[PDB]
Amino acid sequence: DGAPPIMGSSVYITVELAIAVLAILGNVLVCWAVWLNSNLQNVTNYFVVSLAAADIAVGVLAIPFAITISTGFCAACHGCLFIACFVLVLTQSSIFSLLAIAIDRYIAIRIPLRYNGLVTGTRAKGIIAICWVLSFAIGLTPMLGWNNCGQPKEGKNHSQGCGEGQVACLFEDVVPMNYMVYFNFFACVLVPLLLMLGVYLRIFLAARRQLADLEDNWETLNDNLKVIEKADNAAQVKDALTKMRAAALDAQKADFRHGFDILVGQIDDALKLANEGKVKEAQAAAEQLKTTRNAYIQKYLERARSTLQKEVHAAKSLAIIVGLFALCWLPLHIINCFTFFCPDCSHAPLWLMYLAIVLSHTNSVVNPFIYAYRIREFRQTFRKIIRSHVL
Template structure:
């Protein structure tokens, strides 16, 4: 092996190790975020977690296997074949997860009224299980006989019974091109392309219909726009998957259809392999950049659970926690403002709270239209202000959302009354207990 190739091999190994580390860290963060934030525990994100698990396995197992194969270490034939096929299992699982996500988004936008009845958690778990079983069968097909015959011509290099483990010496290109690429990768990618085109066309038609008919459904329009935004993010992930994996499959096609052609330089193969593995690193960045809920949960995990920092606001800024209560069909707002100038929370809106009928309260300013109830880590619970004016037993209905007085946009959740909380469930319980006591 020449010095240039040796340098290329070392560079390849270093880059692969970096990809493995970032793949594991990023996708563990995705799984952690879904477990931590109940707003992320949707059917779509169940498939996202399945995709993240496959990417974690790429970093933990597939990349080390790939590095081992690149060195041509001595192995028995079937051990080498299993190592070569393992990454194919994970690739196929990623493909099926992406296809399931596309179908989920199609149902959510195209036939949204039947979404909750068609797409359930139990069905999603069953689909994920089927996807993994099919991926294992497809990826390990060469182990069932579709492989090259064992070759002992290099017995002088390795001990008796062993051979240099190289991908092209154990896996046949007919399997890689006809079965793995054309049937199990390209066709699903084309299906996903068609599904996302249908999604965007259907969403565009619905938005135009709302405008023409002057439909007064702010929530419906907002919900549809959020679904489209999520679909765009997931379509980007599919596109990046294709960009990352197609070069390696194209090289395999040239190898099969042009056997008399000179093989690609080693550095080109290294680049194609690195690009395919780098796809496992990309998805967490897409979630963080495109999906606000993921971005905020990532920030919370890093600050509170990794850096061990308390949630604080910037010096001199303030944040209002408000609450909308409903009794006898009438809404009333209560507000508590928390200042962070001295790293403490203060209640500064109580002077504006006045008693109205039924023992509820109303606030004269600021006029907030958001529905919110958050219990801060420091300072009094916003609902403590209501204790002394409790009167009557009116049922209180509430939901949660956050309003930032610095001008942060408030996004209403259409399918859930809950919104993201920057505080742990234990820290928020006091608010809910107060509501229950007042009801």
């Protein structure tokens, strides 16, 4: 006996087709927004586009291939291997794009004055092409001989009535589990995911250190200003001015040049007076500094804080994407670890296998939602496309 397999199969196929439709629609919208709006045309979004192209291919190719391989149909083993492994190419390309985004945002926060010269559109395109080539090589490695085509399941192949050179096309009969666990999961997925966690940690720490340094320079300027006011010795005001000059030159190195020239000029004026013994003439000259800091230094410090907060909010938005990739793909990899490392364990049931596959495919739908919710420039362009082109 047993429930007709077509019943559970019809649920699985319908759900896969629903995911395919949404993965295509949302990611086409991402590509159309970057094409239309020049504000979205930057190196970071070229990797966003490469990632959207990989998710479009999940809907157009990997999902029809997943439906085909679920039937266990008779096929030449290398044809079967191509259908089984093509999704691993798209997943590897997604990992390289995510890793590129992380390093791009790290270079922007650590060396912003050298960013536009080091990270160019031409260099990004070249990196995108190399990454797509490497993804085909990694994902299709079983086709080079690391496969179970040489050890066919004779009982399964006669039961389904396959011909000569043909196998019943089932993922776990043709793709070796040692490839899936050691090579694909540990080396190609887990290692870059941990590298990305490291890069994001370094982004947040760099921003936190840069923000604390800005605030320190600001309080150093205001503290020593009060030290000059409540002083009595010419060398006492001379020490507070020398400590202000250092904090002023460090704030400049982190219309703009005009405001700092007035400030450093005024410090140098009040310094020459203090060095000549004129303490009261120095203290009155230092009282003028309060007008310069309120008219130029407070505005520059506020704009530098706002830019850094924007980079932190943008780094968090992109980290959510890496987190959702990990959440959607880890169950399938973890199930494979149990199949491989625990031979005394019952194999995970069929319904759980197909639920883990469906969840990994759901990852190809989620990114356009993160862009729409967390990035204003994508959100506004999405609204323009829908309100005018669709409506």
